[PDB]
Design an enzyme around this catalytic site. Sequence first.
Site, PDB file in Angstrom:
ATOM      1  N   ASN A  95      -1.859   7.273   6.090  1.00 53.42           N
ATOM      2  CA  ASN A  95      -1.248   6.292   6.982  1.00 53.42           C
ATOM      3  C   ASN A  95       0.280   6.241   6.845  1.00 53.42           C
ATOM      4  O   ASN A  95       0.971   5.667   7.704  1.00 53.42           O
ATOM      5  CB  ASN A  95      -1.841   4.899   6.748  1.00 53.42           C
ATOM      6  CG  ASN A  95      -1.465   3.920   7.845  1.00 53.42           C
ATOM      7  OD1 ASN A  95      -1.668   4.201   9.038  1.00 53.42           O
ATOM      8  ND2 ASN A  95      -0.915   2.764   7.457  1.00 53.42           N
ATOM      9  N   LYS A 126       0.799  -1.224   0.000  1.00 50.58           N
ATOM     10  CA  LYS A 126       0.000   0.000   0.000  1.00 50.58           C
ATOM     11  C   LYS A 126       0.841   1.290   0.000  1.00 50.58           C
ATOM     12  O   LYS A 126       0.455   2.259  -0.662  1.00 50.58           O
ATOM     13  CB  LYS A 126      -1.076   0.013   1.100  1.00 50.58           C
ATOM     14  CG  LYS A 126      -0.551  -0.191   2.538  1.00 50.58           C
ATOM     15  CD  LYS A 126      -1.751  -0.183   3.563  1.00 50.58           C
ATOM     16  CE  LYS A 126      -1.276  -0.582   4.965  1.00 50.58           C
ATOM     17  NZ  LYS A 126      -0.683  -1.987   4.948  1.00 50.58           N
ATOM     18  N   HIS A 166      -2.992  -7.735  12.037  1.00 48.65           N
ATOM     19  CA  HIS A 166      -3.794  -6.996  13.032  1.00 48.65           C
ATOM     20  C   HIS A 166      -4.763  -7.887  13.804  1.00 48.65           C
ATOM     21  O   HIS A 166      -5.782  -7.410  14.289  1.00 48.65           O
ATOM     22  CB  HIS A 166      -4.541  -5.828  12.340  1.00 48.65           C
ATOM     23  CG  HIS A 166      -3.622  -4.902  11.582  1.00 48.65           C
ATOM     24  ND1 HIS A 166      -2.559  -4.269  12.176  1.00 48.65           N
ATOM     25  CD2 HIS A 166      -3.607  -4.523  10.279  1.00 48.65           C
ATOM     26  CE1 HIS A 166      -1.931  -3.527  11.278  1.00 48.65           C
ATOM     27  NE2 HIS A 166      -2.560  -3.650  10.124  1.00 48.65           N
TER      28      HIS A 166
HETATM   29  C1  LIG Z   1      -4.805   5.763  22.240  1.00 46.62           C
HETATM   30  C2  LIG Z   1      -3.996   4.991  21.229  1.00 46.62           C
HETATM   31  C3  LIG Z   1      -2.607   4.730  21.791  1.00 46.62           C
HETATM   32  C4  LIG Z   1      -1.749   3.882  20.859  1.00 46.62           C
HETATM   33  O1  LIG Z   1      -1.404   4.629  19.681  1.00 46.62           O
HETATM   34  C5  LIG Z   1      -1.332   4.025  18.433  1.00 46.62           C
HETATM   35  C6  LIG Z   1      -1.515   4.796  17.269  1.00 46.62           C
HETATM   36  C7  LIG Z   1      -1.458   4.175  15.992  1.00 46.62           C
HETATM   37  C8  LIG Z   1      -1.214   2.785  15.912  1.00 46.62           C
HETATM   38  C9  LIG Z   1      -1.138   2.143  14.660  1.00 46.62           C
HETATM   39  C10 LIG Z   1      -0.911   0.760  14.564  1.00 46.62           C
HETATM   40  S1  LIG Z   1      -0.829   0.003  13.124  1.00 46.62           S
HETATM   41  O2  LIG Z   1      -1.278  -1.381  13.231  1.00 46.62           O
HETATM   42  O3  LIG Z   1      -1.613   0.727  12.090  1.00 46.62           O
HETATM   43  N1  LIG Z   1       0.709  -0.030  12.616  1.00 46.62           N
HETATM   44  C11 LIG Z   1       1.666  -1.015  13.149  1.00 46.62           C
HETATM   45  C12 LIG Z   1       3.084  -0.476  12.910  1.00 46.62           C
HETATM   46  C13 LIG Z   1       4.161  -1.519  13.247  1.00 46.62           C
HETATM   47  C14 LIG Z   1       5.555  -0.924  13.264  1.00 46.62           C
HETATM   48  O4  LIG Z   1       5.761   0.269  12.926  1.00 46.62           O
HETATM   49  O5  LIG Z   1       6.462  -1.706  13.632  1.00 46.62           O
HETATM   50  C15 LIG Z   1       1.501  -2.405  12.544  1.00 46.62           C
HETATM   51  O6  LIG Z   1       1.165  -2.486  11.347  1.00 46.62           O
HETATM   52  O7  LIG Z   1       1.713  -3.434  13.243  1.00 46.62           O
HETATM   53  C16 LIG Z   1      -0.729   0.031  15.745  1.00 46.62           C
HETATM   54  C17 LIG Z   1      -0.786   0.653  17.001  1.00 46.62           C
HETATM   55  C18 LIG Z   1      -1.032   2.027  17.091  1.00 46.62           C
HETATM   56  C19 LIG Z   1      -1.089   2.634  18.355  1.00 46.62           C
END
Ligand SMILES: CCCCOc1ccc2cc(S(=O)(=O)N[C@H](CCC(=O)O)C(=O)O)ccc2c1
Length: 433
Positions: A138, A115, A183
């Site tokens: 994103n 993406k 996810h």
């Molecule tokens: C109140 C929310 C507190 C946590 O904040 C967050 C904001 C964006 C998020 C996005 C994502 S996420 O899932 O969109 N991105 C991670 C990125 C992994 C990496 O960079 O190693 C993943 O794909 O596993 C997960 C957790 C998140 C947590």
Amino acid sequence: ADYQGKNVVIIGLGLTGLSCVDFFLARGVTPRVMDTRMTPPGLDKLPEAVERHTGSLNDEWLMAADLIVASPGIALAHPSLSAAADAGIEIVGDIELFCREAQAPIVAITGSNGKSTVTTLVGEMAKAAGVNVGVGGNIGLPALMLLDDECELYVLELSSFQLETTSSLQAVAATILNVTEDHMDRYPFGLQQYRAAKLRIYENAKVCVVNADDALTMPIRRCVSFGVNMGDYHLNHQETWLRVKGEKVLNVKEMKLSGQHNYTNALAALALADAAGLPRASSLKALTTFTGLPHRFEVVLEHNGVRWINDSKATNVGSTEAALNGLHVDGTLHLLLGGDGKSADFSPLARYLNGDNVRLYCFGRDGAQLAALRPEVAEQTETMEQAMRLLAPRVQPGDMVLLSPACASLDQFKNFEQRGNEFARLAKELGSH
Ligand SMILES: CCCCOc1ccc2cc(S(=O)(=O)N[C@H](CCC(=O)O)C(=O)O)ccc2c1
């Protein structure tokens, strides 16, 4: 939309939470901010006049809100958000706020892999046509930071999480590139629930772009398609060409990217750009100039017969599979795996790990699980640095060192970029005498 007089609560800081804060302030609305993390990124950047609550949610604030703006990083299924929803309190995310305001067409891209590449490619196609384009979402800048009434096109990467809180997207062109397990820590109703989130991208889209080779990218109830051997946009092996409906458009020897999955990324990007009305010639030109993204199968060092490759952006099994499938290694592949696997089944990787020329170096939260794919060729450490110092002495001319960890980095790192940057620094140290 008009937010004047509303009690607004934003959950999650960071640059995105900050862009939401700035969005509301500039509109004469002082929001309140909460974050489940005690010291969230950007806390020091948050203006003093903005009230904040960190380390937990605040149900008094949530239940008093007229609008909740939820980070993609918090589940809508969280009891506190579920309670607010049950109360009829409106919940949106940054992408929703953006769509309500944007004054240019939006190309919207999601999928489990490819993406950011497709997003960046469509951006380059627009730039080559002389279009004022805003690229982000994103990746890169949060969407609200792109808003500019001089913008002529927006190209957004959207996650499944962002899509769950978005209702007003009417994309000029939208795609799900593929759907493979990721996810699962946020989707307790499994793969179809995750797929359902991505399928939202097609709602009210002018053109939908689907992967002919992945049935889960198709709406439940025509779309333009791309594929390897079939699709409106497909590949022709002669050398490989990009074709549109039987007509050759590009010999991929002119591309800087390589590998079949990047050729289908190119097709997806061309399909989106065509649908957006971008001129075909400039779009093809962008395909030839684009070099790749940092941390996406990035050669950080090629020295003394050894290639060191930063694929830190591989945060799921399907992405690591894309790096492994068809991979040519002269000597031994030294593969770094590890981190927070998000309850993924790593077993699809096992079929690539047979033979006398693979070693595994497994670390982070799920290191033991990863080592278990083939224990006899695996070492386990706590950290990626330990893993690197373990493997470096074993590296011989003809070998490849590949960080393609199949996991999120968030157990030990801020993000996959910091993990990639650390890998690169260590590669440069360990890969010369
Ligand atoms: C109140 C929310 C507190 C946590 O904040 C967050 C904001 C964006 C998020 C996005 C994502 S996420 O899932 O969109 N991105 C991670 C990125 C992994 C990496 O960079 O190693 C993943 O794909 O596993 C997960 C957790 C998140 C947590």
